Structure formats: C-alpha cells, structure tokens
Design a protein around this ligand. Structure first.
Ligand code: SAH
Length: 256
C-alpha cells in the first residue's frame, strides 16, 4: 500500500495517468477499451459485480451505466479511492472501498461478475494464485471472471531495459499461457485466454498521438520532466508490445 501510494500512484502520478488514459481511468485504452472488453457480457439491474483494483472508478461507472448493475470496487490505495468517491454522487449502486483484495472477505457465491483491469500485475505469483482461489469461491455458480492484465514473454528473454521497468514497478509479469494455467489449476471452466498485444499496441498508439497533440496542455498541468517520462514510457511499451516482449492478456472464465 505505502509503496504504491508513495510512488506509482501518488496523487500527481494518478492524474498524469488519467490525462493519457482518459477521464476516470488509469489503465490501457480507457473508456473505449472498456466498451470492447464488456461487449459480449450480459448483466442486469439485479447483477452484483466486483471490480478488483477499481482505480478512479471508471469501470464501475460504465458497468452501472450500461447494465444498471450493483458495482463494488476495491482498491488498496486510499488516495485513489478518495478521488473515485469524489466523482460519483447520489448512486447507491456504486460503492468504492479502500482495502487490500488479498485480505478482503466476501460471502461464497456472491458475485455475477468479478472484473479486473490491469491490477493483478501488482501481485506476486503466489498471491495471484491465492487471489484466484478466492475469486472462485466468491463467484456465483453462474458467474463469470473477466480480466485484463500485463503479461510478458518468458523471463529468460527479457532485455536490460525491460528487466529494469519490471523491477522498478515491482510487477510480477508472467506469460499469457502461465496465467491461463493458473485459472485452470483453480478449477475455473471455459477458460479463454487471448493475447491482445496487437490491439494493445493500437491503444498505446492512440494514447501516444493524444499526448503529442496535447503537449501544451500537459506542460501547463504538469511539467516537461513528467512529459518526457510519460512519452518515453509509452514509446517503450509500443516497441515492446510490437515485438511481444511485453504483452496484454485477456482472460474470461466461469465457475461452472
Ligand atoms: N492488492 C491490491 N488490492 C486492491 N487493489 C490493488 C492491489 N494492488 C494494486 N491495486 C490497485 O490496482 C490498480 C491498478 S491501475 C488500474 C485501475 C482501474 N482498474 C482502471 O482500469 O483504471 C491501482 O489503483 C492499485 O491501487
């Protein structure tokens, strides 16, 4: 919690990410990607949804808007939850809670959809497995697990630059195939994994173009130093996704 709040997700860090990803988002593709990721998902006003790593709340906002579903977002960063809370009012079907998902308890057979977007990369391998075991219990018999997450080629293939990025971020990045195998080992059914690295590359390019075309505005809100860091960061993701060193994984599975 302290590592994340004092580094990657300081208040300013979150605002910089939001500038490039889009209002209410701090992960890949913002609203447009969310529309696509949820395009084949069916829920209604009676559905219960858990968003693991809910961030600024964009995903809960969209799911509630699209389906009328009850949404409950959990995020470990209290500053981010505070921001999320500031942007939703008068809606008793959107709840945000500051807590570590690894210690959170929910009733078994509780959720119609457990949803997570680029959050589980923060967890160690041991903790990814522990989390998915919890998710299995927490899903309703008829429920669905829906995840996007940063993945990577096998570690043996990483270059110096990518090693440094992963180290600095304290990410644990595994292959798409390894990730799918964890879900299978947790007894999820109908496990579908997709390597969406090409689509991710397209999303990164749109964001990179946006950053460049709105540089003046960015400099006013932030600084040239932060612009350079962001610009170079996206440049590396574009290069590394093109060559499949850094990947974007999509996973969907059911309890039965
Ligand atoms: N153990 C944990 N429990 C809950 N949230 C966690 C967590 N570890 C990291 N996170 C959260 O995961 C989020 C990743 S950023 C993505 C946020 C959101 N899903 C979106 O798409 O915009 C961060 O907000 C971070 O605080």
């Amino acid at each position: 919690k302290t590592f994340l709040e004092n580094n990657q997700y300081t208040d300013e860090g979150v605002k910089v990410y939001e500038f490039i990803f889009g209002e209410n988002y701090i992960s890949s593709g913002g609203l447009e990607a969310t529309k696509k990721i949820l395009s084949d998902i069916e829920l209604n006003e009676n559905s219960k949804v858990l968003d693991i790593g809910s961030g600024l709340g964009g995903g809960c906002m969209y799911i509630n808007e699209k389906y009328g579903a009850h949404t409950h977002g959990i995020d470990i960063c209290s500053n981010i939850v505070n921001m999320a809370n500031e942007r939703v009012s008068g809606n008793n079907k959107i709840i945000f809670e500051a807590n570590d998902i690894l210690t959170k308890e929910f009733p078994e057979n509780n959720f119609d959809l457990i949803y997570s977007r680029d959050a589980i990369l923060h967890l160690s391998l041991e903790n990814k497995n522990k989390l998915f075991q919890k998710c299995y219990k927490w899903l309703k018999p008829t429920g669905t697990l829906l995840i996007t997450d940063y993945c990577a080629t096998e570690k043996e293939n990483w270059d110096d630059e990518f090693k440094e990025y992963v180290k600095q971020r304290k990410y644990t990045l595994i292959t798409v195939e390894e990730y799918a195998d964890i879900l299978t080992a947790c007894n999820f059914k109908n496990v579908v994994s997709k390597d969406l690295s090409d689509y991710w590359n397209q999303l990164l390019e749109v964001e990179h173009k946006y950053l460049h075309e709105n540089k003046e505005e960015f400099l006013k809100l932030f600084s040239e130093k932060k612009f350079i860091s962001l610009d170079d960061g996206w440049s590396r993701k574009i290069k590394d996704s093109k060559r499949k060193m850094q990947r974007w994984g999509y996973f969907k599975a059911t309890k039965n």
